[PDB]
Design a protein around this nucleic acid. Sequence first.
RNA 1: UUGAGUCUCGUAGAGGGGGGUAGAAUUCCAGGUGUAGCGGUGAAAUGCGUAGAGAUCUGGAGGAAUACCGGUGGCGAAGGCGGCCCCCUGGACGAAGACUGACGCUCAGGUGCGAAAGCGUGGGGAGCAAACAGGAUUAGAUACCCUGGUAGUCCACGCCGUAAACGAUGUCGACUUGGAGGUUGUGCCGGCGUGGCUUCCGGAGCUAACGCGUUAAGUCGACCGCCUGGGGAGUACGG
Lengths: 102, 52, 64, 117, 88, 100
Amino acid sequence: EKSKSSKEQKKKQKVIQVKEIKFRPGTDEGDYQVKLRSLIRFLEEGDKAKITLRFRGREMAHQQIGMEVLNRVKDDLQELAVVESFPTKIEGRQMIMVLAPK
Amino acid sequence: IDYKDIATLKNYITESGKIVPSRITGTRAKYQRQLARAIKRARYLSLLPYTD
Amino acid sequence: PVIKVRENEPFDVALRRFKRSCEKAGVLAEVRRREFYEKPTTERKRAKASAVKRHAKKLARENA
Amino acid sequence: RKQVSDGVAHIHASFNNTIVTITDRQGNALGWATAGGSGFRGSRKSTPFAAQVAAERCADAVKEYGIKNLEVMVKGPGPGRESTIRALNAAGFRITNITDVTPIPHXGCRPPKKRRV
Amino acid sequence: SLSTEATAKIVSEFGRDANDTGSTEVQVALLTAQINHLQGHFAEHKKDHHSRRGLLRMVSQRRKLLDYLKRKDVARYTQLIERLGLRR
Amino acid sequence: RHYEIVFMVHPDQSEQVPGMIERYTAAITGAEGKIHRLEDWGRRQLAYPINKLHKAHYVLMNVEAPQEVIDELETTFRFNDAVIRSMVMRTKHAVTEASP
RNA sequence: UUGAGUCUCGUAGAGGGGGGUAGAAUUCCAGGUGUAGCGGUGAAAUGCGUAGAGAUCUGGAGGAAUACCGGUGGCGAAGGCGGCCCCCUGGACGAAGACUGACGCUCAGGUGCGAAAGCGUGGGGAGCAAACAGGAUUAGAUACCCUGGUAGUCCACGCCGUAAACGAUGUCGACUUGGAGGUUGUGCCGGCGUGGCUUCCGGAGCUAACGCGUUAAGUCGACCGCCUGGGGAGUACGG
Ligand SMILES: NC(=O)OC[C@@H](O)C[C@H](NC(=O)[C@H]1NCCC[C@H]1O)C(=O)N[C@@H](Cc1c[nH]cn1)C(=O)N[C@H](C(=O)O)[C@H](O)c1c[nH]c(Cl)n1
Ligand SMILES: [K+]
Ligand SMILES: [K+]
Ligand SMILES: [K+]
Ligand SMILES: [K+]
Ligand SMILES: [Mg+2]
Ligand SMILES: [Mg+2]
Ligand SMILES: [Mg+2]
Ligand SMILES: [Mg+2]
Ligand SMILES: [Mg+2]
Ligand SMILES: [Mg+2]
Ligand SMILES: [Mg+2]
Ligand SMILES: [Mg+2]
Ligand SMILES: [Mg+2]
Ligand SMILES: [Mg+2]
Ligand SMILES: [Mg+2]
Ligand SMILES: [Mg+2]
């Protein structure tokens, strides 16, 4: 039945998707700011953000460079975000902090 | 060519009422132009049909 | 394409006549060309390439 | 109810869907059935078979009016042009005139832009 | 264009004969007649740029013929422009 | 300057056509009218409906006249609510010979 | 009088401006019939529909554009120009003459015309659709795809003055083997000629080559425009 319509109105409840910005150990200020902007938006518009850093070949040997990038994001997106997850180990070659709308 | 000459004009229209190419009918270009004018004048007066 | 089934005709024969009436009249080709907008430069370009192809086939029919 | 001797089968055969509608001779709706309402969904609707089924269900809707003659009025470039009328004749209507409507502008309005795919 | 009667009048008036259609007087008289006639056309039809190109050709042809007549014979020139009412 | 005037009259008003054909020719022959041809074609079957009418009373006239009087005649056809359609044409020469 | 013009007669043409009008189609409105879907995609969803849609039929309203004909067909200086009819109007071409008597060619500066977008003012607004809104897709998707949709697209008047505004080929004149077509005149007796415009091929010649090739990019003459390594830059500054 047009019953359906009920759902259409029900479906005017809402929904959060997680959006994935991948950073790399040495991304530069310009692109950081672009991706940072993307996240601000993502978050302010009610969404989560799986922020991934993706070491490639030998870069996996200076994981501590990576962690500093994540820590910079956390510290910029501070008043907008709370940090569901942080990583410590480097499973695979990744570090997959998940931020959520404060 | 004459717009009133429905008999001749009907040889150069299809069943739907569309003008036939000169490549098909073998008409000369000059007369094909007169033919097309005649048919459109006949269509206006409702002597020939546009469609169907 | 108006096809009255004549005095005592089968359907399969009558359907062949109807489909052929549409094929000659040019209805499916006409609807498909009018589906999306073609700007005059594209129309003219298409018409030129056809004319080149048609004519070039005659020069391939000739010299052979 | 009324009985109708001769009917008209309007076949709105779009690219995505087929609508079969049996009317009176004056275009009063008696019954209708679509490929979308025939347990076909999405691009399943846009097959000849889904139109065939839609024809059959349309025939079943207008059994009560007691129609034996139908005039066909097919419209559009849809995949289910011929499959409808074949299936209509299989229902046991005597098909008289078989006829292509299909609105063609004599120029008319500017069409939508080409899909870049 | 001018009518055949309008042309035939001018040829008789400004020519040495009815046969004499070639003379600069006739030519300028013909051009003047049409130039003056078309002033009404382009008054109404301001946007008719394609026709106006034809008018400018008449004016340009008249000018060139008058300039030729001036250096050929000033007496004929002076008579002609006063008859037709041309400034120059 | 040599015209050809077809006009189609409402088929119920075929009886008015006598009086109208007089008026038009009388106006044309007023000012050097040369009625080369005049053919009452009669109530013919229309190839398509005009105003829910499947018939109309056709008339043909090939006339030479002033270019003002024809424009003045065209004004009357507009006002004539009976007459449904008309094509005034320009012919180069007079047509005396009969049409089918 | 051979260049350049004028006149006589005729021919073809979407050449231009104005007015009227026809049929088809989309949308919308009002009804009738009818009943649960419609629409859309790669797949979906947004969207629309029981306040009755889509479909079908009747009538009405309004705007924009003119299927077929339609053609390496035509016309125009170029830009461009396509229903039919009338009015006003520009050019081209052919046939014979008659007429003028070098009146010519080119043209810095100048003047005008000049697709589309755009701008100003006032109208109009069906369809389409930058922006935008929502739905998707994706690593992201400020896109391509879907549903909507504003400017605009249309008209008047004024402005803008640019486009791969291209034949990427300035204009005018003369000369120099051929072949096959198209379109439009015309003479003579379908044939035999002879003019205009135009498509394709190709000879000499030319060209870096590609190619061009009597519509030259060949052989010459007149006049104009323009170039002088790439980027910086068609930018800065000034007018
Ligand atoms: N999004 C991103 O970052 O990456 C994804 C992108 O690479 C997907 C890829 N997309 C395409 O080729 C585009 N072609 C133009 C139309 C739109 C779209 O289709 C693609 O695979 N398409 C598929 C359909 C699809 C989209 N997402 C998952 N599947 C497809 O069928 N593409 C067709 C093709 O590749 O030929 C075609 O382009 C098409 C038909 N219909 C549509 Cl929509 N696209
Ligand atoms: K009237
Ligand atoms: K000069
Ligand atoms: K709009
Ligand atoms: K070579
Ligand atoms: Mg042109
Ligand atoms: Mg152009
Ligand atoms: Mg010059
Ligand atoms: Mg514009
Ligand atoms: Mg404005
Ligand atoms: Mg749209
Ligand atoms: Mg869109
Ligand atoms: Mg430029
Ligand atoms: Mg250039
Ligand atoms: Mg060549
Ligand atoms: Mg060279
Ligand atoms: Mg600049």
